[PDB]
Amino acid sequence: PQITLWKRPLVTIKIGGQLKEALLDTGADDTIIEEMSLPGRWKPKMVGGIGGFIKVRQYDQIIIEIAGHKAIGTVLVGPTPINIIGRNLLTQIGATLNF
Amino acid sequence: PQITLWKRPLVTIKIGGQLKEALLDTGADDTIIEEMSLPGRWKPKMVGGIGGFIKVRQYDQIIIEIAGHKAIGTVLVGPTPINIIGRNLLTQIGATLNF
Ligand SMILES: CC(C)CN(C[C@@H](O)[C@H](Cc1ccccc1)NC(=O)O[C@H]1CO[C@H]2OCC[C@H]21)S(=O)(=O)c1ccc(N)cc1
Ligand SMILES: [Cl-]
Ligand SMILES: [Cl-]
Ligand code: NA
């Protein structure tokens, strides 16, 4: 796909057996999803942005289908106002910025 | 250019005659720069990010060069942790997301 940026670049993802919508975010180092359960081990992390930091759970080796493209990587889970696909998984689907 | 996402997509910007670095951020509606002086009047705006909201100064019709492309548009100034180029100016320089 080529995605213009006139509106937010929202896509459908599948994670943990659940379909969700998420923002493709080149400004995010990491992927962060709103509170949900995921299997396996986790460790606590703080992640910071505009407005300050939030505490999240870091799960490693989680598979996510992103607009029909599979990726595996770390997923943070916590009180983010929107689900965000960050660079750690955007690389894996071959996403690039073009101008 | 075609910019991969293995590293942060940082580019040089020029605003008020000064070179700065900024992040190309598809997850940002709005361009926001760290504190600096800009001409004209400003308007109030609240910006909500991962960690809560911040107050910023909204300047309209500001001339800004981004990675060698000319844009003229709205720039917010406030305590962002990093200079960010959001979709309002990414559209002006013709940027798309591709995968
Ligand atoms: C601020 C950037 C350096 C980092 N952010 C990614 C960014 O794209 C967020 C992503 C985002 C989007 C919506 C709400 C919260 C965060 N956008 C954002 O805060 O933009 C604000 C300015 O324009 C506005 O439009 C969106 C909210 C405003 S972040 O959400 O804090 C974040 C930080 C670290 C990770 N790993 C993942 C995400
Ligand atoms: Cl990862
Ligand atoms: Cl104010
Ligand atoms: Na795991």
Q: CA–CA separation, B51 vs A68, rounded Å?
A: 30
> Which domain, by its residues, includes A77?
1-99
Catalytic annotation on A25? Answer: yes
SS3 A80: coil
CB A85 within 8 A of CB B26: no
Tell me how far CA of residue A72 lies from CA of A48, A61, A94, in angstroms.
Answer: 23, 6, 13
Instruction: For residue B6, give the CATH number of its domain.
Output: 2.40.70.10
Write out the two tokens for A17: 């057996």
> How many structural domains is chain A composed of?
1
CB A14 within 8 A of CB A67: no
Considering only CA atoms, which residue is closest to atom 36 of ligand 1? A30
Write out the two tokens for B45: 């705006």
Name the amino acid, one letter, at A53.
F
Angle at A28 between CA A66 and CA B56, to 5 degrees: 130
In this complex, is the C-beta atom of A47 within 8 Å of any C-beta atom belonging to chain B?
A: yes
CB A99 within 8 A of CB B89: no
Q: CA–CA separation, B44 vs B57, rounded Å?
A: 5
CA of B65 to the centre of ligand 1 (A): 22
In A, minimum Cα distance to B33 occurs at A50
Q: Report CB contact under 8 Å: A97, B26.
A: yes
CA of A52 to the centre of ligand 1 (A): 11
